[PDB]
Enzyme design. Structure first.
Site, PDB file in Angstrom:
ATOM      1  N   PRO A   1       3.746  -2.464   1.088  1.00 23.91           N
ATOM      2  CA  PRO A   1       3.497  -2.754   2.502  1.00 23.91           C
ATOM      3  C   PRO A   1       2.020  -2.707   2.856  1.00 23.91           C
ATOM      4  O   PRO A   1       1.184  -2.193   2.109  1.00 23.91           O
ATOM      5  CB  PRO A   1       4.263  -1.641   3.223  1.00 23.91           C
ATOM      6  CG  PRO A   1       4.200  -0.497   2.275  1.00 23.91           C
ATOM      7  CD  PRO A   1       4.231  -1.086   0.887  1.00 23.91           C
TER       8      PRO A   1
ATOM      9  N   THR B   1       0.825  -1.202   0.000  1.00 21.45           N
ATOM     10  CA  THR B   1       0.000   0.000   0.000  1.00 21.45           C
ATOM     11  C   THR B   1       0.862   1.256   0.000  1.00 21.45           C
ATOM     12  O   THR B   1       1.567   1.537   0.971  1.00 21.45           O
ATOM     13  CB  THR B   1      -0.945   0.039   1.217  1.00 21.45           C
ATOM     14  N   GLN B   2       0.805   2.011  -1.100  1.00 17.45           N
ATOM     15  CA  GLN B   2       1.558   3.257  -1.175  1.00 17.45           C
ATOM     16  C   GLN B   2       1.001   4.307  -0.223  1.00 17.45           C
ATOM     17  O   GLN B   2       1.761   4.925   0.529  1.00 17.45           O
ATOM     18  CB  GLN B   2       1.562   3.785  -2.609  1.00 17.45           C
TER      19      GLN B   2
END
Lengths: 212, 247, 233, 232, 229, 239, 240, 233
Positions: A105, A1-2
């Site tokens: 992540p 996950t940005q």
């Protein structure tokens, strides 16, 4: 996950004699907004292990279906071996570390409690793979607004009871309601004991008093 | 599955390749084609297989399949198996002109295909190409050249050679009437017709059963021109009339 | 006649000859014996003599701290499967930080061993393994065969002339659980002794004894360490 | 991709495809070469000249490098793949090492390549045998022989192709320090061995000599007749 | 996983048996007769259903590749279909690159190359279908024949299917280079009459033409008009 | 030589590699199941070869999900792979669709996994026959059986093992539609012992399981208290 | 008669007569099921009828069916190996679904059979895979052409039908119903269900009961394929 | 008829069963493991007098402290000794230590029995190795001498003879060998048995011998050093 979208707030925790108890309020957060307040961020993994998480709620549902389903797979053959609370904490720490290596992540910040072999287990799993075991745990802003109150009681009295640790969690949760914008009034309390994990219904902080 | 495999790439107890040796016999029944190395040019005389009257003309030729501006070939074998070879030859020759910005030497293009024709005689378990095709052309070093590429993957230079039906009796005639270095272009056109007579079961040549293409240098440019029906009939009438004067 | 060349070809009797020929190789191997009590599980195996001057073999390999195996079959196929077992046990402690249950390790063997059996151009694993390990459920003798199926045994012996050893194990199988650590190995020794010709006896150099337990991890005993166990035999 | 085992074991420990690959070696032209003092000589026996051949591209003596060359016997196609790929290794070795290839290095690369296709899936062994000569950095002559099975051995004199059993016995008794002394006498040693395996007569053969200074220059048909006239 | 070994191998007599036996399936198929006239090319095939329950308007043995190109077959039904749908793909791949209507001779070489690929690569059998290909390009008519081996031949007139030997000799007599498209249709129908054994009608055959206006198959109404003569 | 490959039909249009695969099921001990109104009850005759084998070894009853059970008859090797594949079939469903897999869908996904290996010569058909059963509130009880050919039919009861016809005669007269799960458990043990042969196969271990409403849609092995009651009741009727 | 040489008896390749010696045995594999399907189309409707035989009383009648729903407006009936049956139906449902996702509209019966015929053709050309031992009969209502009944075989032949027969009685049911090619449309309307029933009941001489068979239809007024309940089948069976 | 992966009615795996028979066509190789060191002696089997004996290497350098003797086809063992040299460098690279002889023979023997024609890898071995390698050297456990069979079965041997004459040569090793013998006696005892099993005349040209001492590294005797041992025999 940005970047996260719908985020959770501080999830508390403490270990007492006979089990471990954590609590988290029910609210969604997108861009300083309360959107979904009916979402439950406390998950019951299996009989001997309980889990709760802050951070992204969408990534938490992925950890609901991936981790919760592995419990069924271990119960299919049924040889008598079940996942211990520190084994799920180890598998989950490994899954969280493998995501940051590929730069994908999971924004979740998690607290894993459990009671097995007559020993109460409590553990912390973050987005970056930082993991350890502490008698009291608070995530997000709970480290600032709560954990100081958690360590203060546990320093004088290392071992608590089920009723005394419950007042410790309810008092720290009320402090989170005052000074945290991401907090919420209603909150879930789940407790693991020798009889298994029991997730209580909604409890209100409305007993709070504001003097202006 | 091993039961269904025919073991094409294996070796015989005598040291022979089955599919390679059996592909040579397909050429012995294939179209008769020959070539002659002369001083000012090289030619290809190929006996046309299907003489059928309802056959039309499509593009420029039948068994020729010109590979480049500076060189051409002629094919004898399975009519289909020659097409993929001529396409790859046009691919290899143009990748050279693309890579080196030069016309492909005739020695290099033959070596390249003989490695591809060999690739199926060694690994992959496929069948080899049943076509042995000749080569004519011109380069900046050795000039005019004539090659013969067998399905086994080996090639070699030839002053005079023949492929296809009755190739053994055709080479024997090219061992005598041919003279090294003394053969010109017009003398080679008469020698090609002389061989195409005794090596074909037909009583004579009507010019529709043969196709001849010549390669010469004109003003520093290689030209490849297939002799038309009227130009081949003049060669047949010249040899048929000269045969009566020799007896 | 023509059904034995391929493992994927069924016989008219509903039988696979290729898998059964792989189970013939484990019976042409060396006799290996293992058994468990309520406390410890012990593996006792004959190390085969190829010649008089050669150190016999090592037929017992280390898989994990709590798990051990005994080899009967092709030796190179044993460690090829054992390296997967060693990788599988390290997979749990790496990911789960817990010892992997012996019952689950053998289930992974039956899934991997079956893949060569059903596919063309591949052969079944021709090595059997007597797996001794201590999980939370106690000792485990779980057996692996060239056929992907596995069996949970109280005592088992495989290899050449292992039927004479199974006769000894089936008679005394009632008293195995009440045996102490020192007397437990002696049952596997007498069971393995029945696998030898009348002109052969159990020495210290040809016998290796694996032992796994609760407070004791899996350890192998060499020719010098098997002397206290052979003192009562 | 085609994956199948062409070369498999047989009763009494034999390899059919490998042994039959050596049968194609004895079915090819005869190639004979020797190792002298400062000089090495390679030669082949052409079956039929016919005077229709272009003698340049039909040469069975190739050059793998300036200091390394080889002559084969067998299927002509199986050879060209070996020469072409070995010349790539000779150039790639000059890239990293910055030194000319040693004669044993390229021999092991060709022997390992002949070995690789024996144990590889869906690939047949080579039907050729190679005679490699060369000079090291110190100037010592080298003569090696490779087999379709992948084995390589050095030789003082060697013969491959058809009739090699009779030429090898001819080279065995006639090889000495006197015949390998003079550079011209070393050339005549190969021709005397080639004339025994050639049943046609005269010189149909092709011979190439590689020295140290000014490497190799292949002998013309007119120059080879001068040695045949002296041995008559 | 598929077989990587070629099913077609050279016989000890120097022939390919799988292609030679593929011609037998072509010889036992339904007769198809192409004729190349001056202004156009006609393709006439015999479409005969085993019963009256079969739908004649369902499948078309004469199918167009592009608007200006169409082709008919003598042989198996299915082996033609995967062959003809790829011919439609290879034709438009030319139209994508060159933005030009594909020539007929260029289309035949690409289809014959695919028919060759399955006579060589392993795991696949040759086609049992032969093609009669027509088209109009550069102001000239085109008629070609694709063999199962992958070889092509330019024909003015020819025939395949059942009794092709007796049929081919029938064309050479009545064929002329000065014939038009209207005169070539009747001569193609008379060849289908050479071996029929029954009473032929508009639904008992399938005919199509390729002229300067493009390729189209004759409707059953237009076929009946040509059967009265 | 038509029988040397699963991709080769016989002159009469039969595939022997598929037909020889189900013959290995006939060499395996009898396993049966009964679909009743309150759920699905399973049973297996498990033959132990040597007394050295521990009780519970070579388990014939697999759980591919929490509400779905599995009972196999055939080669035990091919039984454990198809169990794991049926687990993955139910695993990928709950991941994508988020709810329990209907056994109508689960049996169809596995039946095609078995049939996918009957069309090629590079693989062999499975030599084991296995049955599926489950319970749901809306869907109710369901019982399907997949043959080695990859075909799946619905069954109120089925018999696969050494004697196929012998157990079907006992199940057909049982009248299971009006009977609950607890009444079937006593009847399944009666059918296992009557089809058993006291001559050829001596030692055996009765393996039983059910699924139904009393477990709230869950499949589990029979507790010793209920199992001992059904075995004693079955031996009383055996005489 | 037909010569046989080489591997023709195992892998699909050219027989000496070019008959595909191996492919012809996939048609005989259809008769191994011992069943017969009768499909016929009328003017406004198309009907499919097949035999439903329960070998044991323990079978579940609702679960055992040869009629399958490929899409909303397209029905199916299968004759052949039932194991091969379910495989070809799942491929037809997956192929018809790719049509709607790629091309935007519901697939006609025309090109749903050809793609499956092209898939079954791949089994015939490749030696590593055998053809399917069953034949698929697909029906539906086309926009322009109306009712359509097609059948594809193991050889890949999807060519159209005014009526379709399959199974062991295919030869007997085709010639008997071919005499019903007489009057135009053979009195084609909603009662063509009996047209398929009387053809199936004549060849087997069974005189089927209400639950002895299974019937389904597609119509212009109701384009969705419906499987007729045994109570509705009894209404048509009692009328004949 | 049949493939490379098949089990015999006795489970002998014909391909390796026939690969062991290929060893019986190779030259004789003999070695002895003493307490003062190990020795490796092998016959060159000179085919013709024109063959240079210096180009026949049946004993090659694996590591500095390790050496190996070969038999059978010289080619098939060239790929195994190459992977051994890479394996010894991969261990010294990562762990910065001399690789033990136990792991060298075990790693090379892993390539044995691993072959197939079905989906093995992009490159693959069509057949196993028909060669028998005698591994030797001094490790932390002392001088060790190992053997590698085509079946991947490696065995610790004090003295072992391989090759065509292996039968009858091993019987000569068991008589003259004892645990207290030195290295000088091992070099002399090797050539005496070689004199019996070699057809041609035994001299410094046709014999190839190398030893590994604990103090020194792997070294092969030259032409002048072999003349002293032969005169003593």
């Amino acid at each position: 996950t940005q970047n996260p979208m719908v985020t959770g707030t501080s999830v508390l925790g403490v270990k007492f004699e006979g089990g471990v108890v954590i609590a988290a309020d029910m609210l969604g957060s997108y861009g300083s907004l309360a959107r979904f307040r009916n979402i439950s961020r406390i998950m019951r993994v299996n009989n001997s292990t309980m889990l709760g998480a802050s951070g992204d709620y969408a990534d938490f549902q992925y950890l609901k279906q991936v981790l919760g389903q592995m419990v069924i797979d271990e119960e299919l053959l049924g040889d008598g071996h079940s996942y211990s609370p520190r084994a799920i904490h180890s598998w989950l720490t490994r899954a969280m570390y493998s995501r940051r290596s590929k730069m994908n992540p999971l924004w979740n910040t998690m607290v894993i409690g459990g009671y097995a072999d007559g020993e109460s287990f409590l553990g912390y799993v973050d987005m970056l793979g930082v993991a350890y075991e502490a008698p009291s745990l608070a995530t997000g802003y709970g480290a600032y607004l709560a954990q100081p109150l958690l360590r203060e009681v546990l320093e004088k009295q290392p071992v608590l009871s089920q009723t005394e640790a419950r007042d410790l969690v309810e008092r720290c949760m009320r402090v989170l309601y005052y000074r945290d914008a991401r907090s919420y009034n209603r909150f879930q309390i789940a407790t693991v004991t020798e009889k298994g994990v029991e997730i209580e219904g909604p409890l209100s902080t409305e007993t709070n008093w504001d003097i202006a | 599955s091993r039961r269904y495999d025919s073991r094409t790439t294996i070796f015989s107890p005598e040291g022979r390749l089955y599919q390679v040796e059996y592909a040579m016999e397909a050429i012995g029944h294939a179209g008769t084609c020959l070539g002659i190395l002369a001083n000012d040019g090289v030619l290809l005389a190929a006996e046309r297989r299907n003489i059928h009257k309802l056959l039309d003309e499509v593009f420029f030729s039948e068994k020729i399949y010109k590979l480049n501006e500076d060189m051409a070939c002629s094919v004898a074998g399975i009519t289909s198996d020659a097409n993929v070879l001529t396409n790859e030859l046009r691919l290899i020759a143009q990748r050279y002109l693309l890579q080196y910005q030069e016309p492909i030497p005739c020695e290099q293009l033959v070596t390249a295909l003989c490695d591809i024709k060999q690739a199926y005689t060694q690994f992959g378990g496929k069948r080899p190409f049943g076509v042995s095709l000749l080569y004519i052309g011109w380069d900046k070093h050795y000039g005019f050249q004539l090659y013969q590429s067998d399905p086994s993957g080996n090639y070699g230079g030839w002053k005079a050679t023949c492929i296809g039906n009755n190739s053994a009796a055709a080479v024997s005639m090219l061992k005598q009437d041919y003279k090294e270095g003394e053969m010109t272009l017009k003398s080679a056109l008469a020698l090609a017709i002389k061989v195409l007579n005794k090596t074909m079961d037909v009583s004579k040549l009507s010019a529709e059963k043969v196709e001849i293409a010549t390669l010469t240098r004109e003003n520093g440019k290689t030209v490849i021109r297939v002799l038309k029906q009227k130009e081949v009939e003049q060669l047949i009438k010249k040899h048929e009339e000269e045969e009566a004067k020799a007896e | 006649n023509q059904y034995d060349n391929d493992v994927t070809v069924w016989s008219p009797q509903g039988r696979i000859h290729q898998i059964e020929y792989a189970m013939e190789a484990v019976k042409q191997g060396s006799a290996t014996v293992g058994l468990k009590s309520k406390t410890h599980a012990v593996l006792v195996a004959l190390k085969r003599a190829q010649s008089e001057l050669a150190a016999h073999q090592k037929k017992i390999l280390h898989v994990d701290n709590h798990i051990g195996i005994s080899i009967a079959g092709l030796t190179a196929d044993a460690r090829l499967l054992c390296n997967f077992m060693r990788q599988e046990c390290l997979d749990s402690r790496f990911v789960f930080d817990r010892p992997l249950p012996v019952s689950r390790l053998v289930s992974l063997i039956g899934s991997k061993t079956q893949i060569p059996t059903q596919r063309y151009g591949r052969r079944p694993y021709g090595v059997g393994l007597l797996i001794a390990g201590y999980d939370d459920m106690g000792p485990h003798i779980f057996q692996t065969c060239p056929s992907a199926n596995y069996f949970d045994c109280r005592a088992m012996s495989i290899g050449a002339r292992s039927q004479s050893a199974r006769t000894y194990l089936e008679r005394h199988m009632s008293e195995f659980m009440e045996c102490n650590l020192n007397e437990l190995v002696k049952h596997g020794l007498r069971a393995l002794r029945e696998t030898l010709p009348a002109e052969q006896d159990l020495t210290t150099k040809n016998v290796s004894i694996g032992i796994v337990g609760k407070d004791l991890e899996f350890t192998i005993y060499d020719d010098d360490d098997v002397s206290p166990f052979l003192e009562g035999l | 991709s085609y994956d199948r085992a062409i070369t498999v074991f047989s009763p009494d420990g034999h390899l059919f495809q490998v042994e039959y690959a050596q049968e194609a070696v004895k079915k090819g032209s005869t190639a004979v070469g020797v190792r002298g003092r400062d000089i090495v000589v390679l030669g082949v026996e052409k079956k039929s000249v016919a005077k229709l051949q272009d003698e340049r591209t039909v040469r069975k003596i190739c050059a793998l490098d300036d200091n390394v060359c080889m002559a084969f016997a067998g299927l002509t196609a199986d050879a060209r793949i070996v020469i072409n790929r070995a010349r790539v290794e000779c150039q790639s070795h000059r890239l990293t090492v910055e030194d000319p290839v040693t004669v044993e290095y390229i021999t092991r690369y060709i022997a390992s390549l002949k070995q690789r296709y024996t144990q590889s899936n869906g690939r047949r062994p080579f039907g050729i045998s190679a005679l490699i000569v060369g000079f090291d950095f110190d100037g010592t002559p080298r003569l090696y022989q490779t087999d379709p099975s992948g084995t390589y051995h050095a030789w003082k004199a060697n013969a491959i192709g058809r009739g090699a059993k009779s030429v090898r016995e001819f080279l065995e008794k006639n090889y000495t320090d006197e015949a390998i002394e003079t550079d011209d006498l070393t050339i005549k040693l190969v021709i005397k061995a080639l004339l025994e395996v050639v049943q046609s007569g005269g010189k149909n053969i092709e011979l190439a000599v590689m020295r140290r200074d000014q490497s190799l220059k292949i002998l013309n048909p007119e120059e080879i007749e001068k040695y045949v006239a002296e041995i008559e | 996983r598929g077989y990587s070994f070629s099913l077609t191998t050279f016989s000890p007599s120097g022939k390919l048996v799988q292609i030679e036996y593929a011609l037998a399936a072509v010889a036992g198929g339904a007769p198809s007769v192409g004729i190349k006239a001056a202004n156009g090319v006609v393709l006439a095939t015999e479409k005969k259903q085993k019963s009256i329950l079969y739908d004649e308007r369902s499948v078309h043995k004469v199918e167009p590749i592009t608007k200006h190109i169409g082709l008919v077959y003598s042989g198996m039904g299915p082996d033609y279909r995967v062959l003809v749908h790829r011919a439609r793909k290879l034709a438009q791949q030319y139209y994508l690159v060159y933005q030009e209507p594909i020539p007929t001779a260029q289309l035949v070489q690409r289809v014959a190359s695919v028919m060759q690929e399955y006579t060589q690569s392993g795991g696949v059998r040759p086609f049992g279908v032969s093609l009669l290909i027509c088209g109009w390009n550069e102001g000239r008519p085109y008629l070609f024949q694709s063999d199962p081996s992958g070889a092509y031949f330019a024909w003015k007139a020819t025939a395949m299917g059942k009794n092709y030997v007796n049929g081919k000799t029938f064309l050479e007599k009545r064929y002329n280079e000065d014939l038009e498209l209207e005169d070539a249709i009747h001569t193609a129908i008379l060849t289908l009459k050479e071996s029929f054994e029954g009473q032929m009608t508009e639904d008992n055959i399938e005919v199509g033409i390729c002229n300067e206006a493009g390729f189209r198959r004759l409707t059953p109404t237009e076929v009946k008009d040509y059967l009265a003569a | 030589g038509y029988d040397l490959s699963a991709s080769t039909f016989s002159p009469d249009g039969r595939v022997f590699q598929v037909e020889y695969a189900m013959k290995a099921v006939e060499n395996s001990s009898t396993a049966i199941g009964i679909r009743c109104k309150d759920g699905v009850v399973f049973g297996v005759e498990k033959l132990v070869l040597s007394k050295l084998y521990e009780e519970g070894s070579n388990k014939r009853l697999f759980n591919v999900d929490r509400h779905v059970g599995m009972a196999v008859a055939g080669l035990l090797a091919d039984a454990r792979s198809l169990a794991d594949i049926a687990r993955e079939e139910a695993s990928n469903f709950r991941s994508n669709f988020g709810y329990n897999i209907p056994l109508k869908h689960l049996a169809d996904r596995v039946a095609m996994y078995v049939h996918a290996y009957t069309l090629y010569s590079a693989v062999r058909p499975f030599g084991c026959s296995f049955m599926l059963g489950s319970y749901s509130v809306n869907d109710g009880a369901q019982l399907y059986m997949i043959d080695p050919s990859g075909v799946s039919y619905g069954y109120w009861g089925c018999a696969i093992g050494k004697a196929r016809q012998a157990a079907k005669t006992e199940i057909e007269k049982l009248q299971m539609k009006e009977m609950t799960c607890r009444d079937i458990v006593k009847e399944v043990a009666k059918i296992i012992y009557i089809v058993h042969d006291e001559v050829k196969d001596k030692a055996f271990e009765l393996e039983l399981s059910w699924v139904g409403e009393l477990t709230n849609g869950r499949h589990e092995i029979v507790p010793k208290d209920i199992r001992e009651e059904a075995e004693k009741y079955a031996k009383e009727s055996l005489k | 008669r037909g010569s046989s040489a080489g591997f023709d008896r195992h892998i699909t390749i050219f027989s000496p007569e070019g008959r595909l010696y191996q492919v012809e045995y996939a048609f005989k594999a259809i008769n191994q099921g011992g069943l017969t399907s009768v499909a016929v189309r009328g003017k406004d409707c198309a009907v499919i009828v097949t035999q439903k035989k329960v070998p044991d009383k323990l079978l579940d009648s609702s679960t055992v069916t040869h009629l399958f729903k490929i899409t909303e407006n397209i029905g199916c009936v299968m004759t052949g190996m039932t194991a091969d049956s379910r495989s070809q139906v799942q491929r037809a449902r997956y192929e018809a679904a790719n049509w709607k996702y790629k091309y935007g509209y519901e697939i006609p019966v025309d090109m749903l059979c050809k793609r499956i015929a092209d898939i079954s053709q791949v089994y015939t050309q490749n030696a590593e895979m055998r053809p399917l031992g069953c034949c698929m009969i697909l029906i539906g209502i086309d926009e322009e052409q109306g009712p359509q009944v097609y059948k594809c075989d193991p050889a890949g032949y999807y060519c159209g039908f005014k009526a379709t027969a399959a199974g062991v009685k295919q030869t007997e049911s085709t010639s008997f119903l071919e005499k019903k090619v007489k009057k135009k449309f053979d009195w084609t309307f909603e009662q063509t269900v009996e047209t398929a029933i009387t053809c199936l009941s004549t060849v087997l001489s069974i005189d089927f009961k209400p639950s002895e068979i299974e019937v389904g239809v597609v119509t212009v007024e109701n384009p969705k394929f419906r499987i007729l309940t045994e109570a509705e089948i009894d209404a048509h069976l009692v009328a004949l | 008829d049949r493939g490379v992966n098949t089990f015999s009615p006795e489970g002998r795996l014909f391909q390796v069963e026939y690969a062991i028979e290929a060893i019986k066509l190779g030259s004789t190789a003999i070695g002895i493991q003493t307490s003062e060191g190990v020795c490796l002696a092998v016959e060159k089997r000179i085919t013709s007098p024109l063959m240079e004996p210096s180009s026949i290497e049946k004993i090659v350098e694996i590591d500095a402290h390790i050496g190996c003797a070969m038999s059978g086809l010289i080619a098939d063992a060239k790929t195994l000794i190459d992977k051994a040299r890479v394996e010894t460098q991969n261990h010294w690279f990562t762990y910065n230590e001399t690789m033990t002889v136990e792991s060298v023979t075990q790693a090379v023997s892993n390539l044995a029995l691993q072959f197939g024609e079905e989906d093995a890898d992009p490159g693959a071995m069509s057949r196993p190795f028909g060669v028998a390698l005698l591994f030797g050297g001094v490790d932390e456990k002392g001088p060790q001498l190992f053997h590698m069979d085509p079946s991947g079965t490696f065995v610790q041997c004090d003295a072992r003879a391989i090759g065509s004459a292996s039968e009858g040569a091993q019987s000569s090793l068991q008589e003259v060998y004892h645990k207290s013998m030195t290295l000088k006696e091992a070099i002399k005892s090797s050539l005496i048995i070689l004199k019996q099993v070699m057809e041609e005349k035994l001299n410094a040209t046709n014999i190839e011998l190398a030893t590994v001492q604990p103090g020194q590294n792997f070294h092969m005797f030259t032409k002048e050093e072999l003349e002293e041992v032969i005169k003593d025999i």
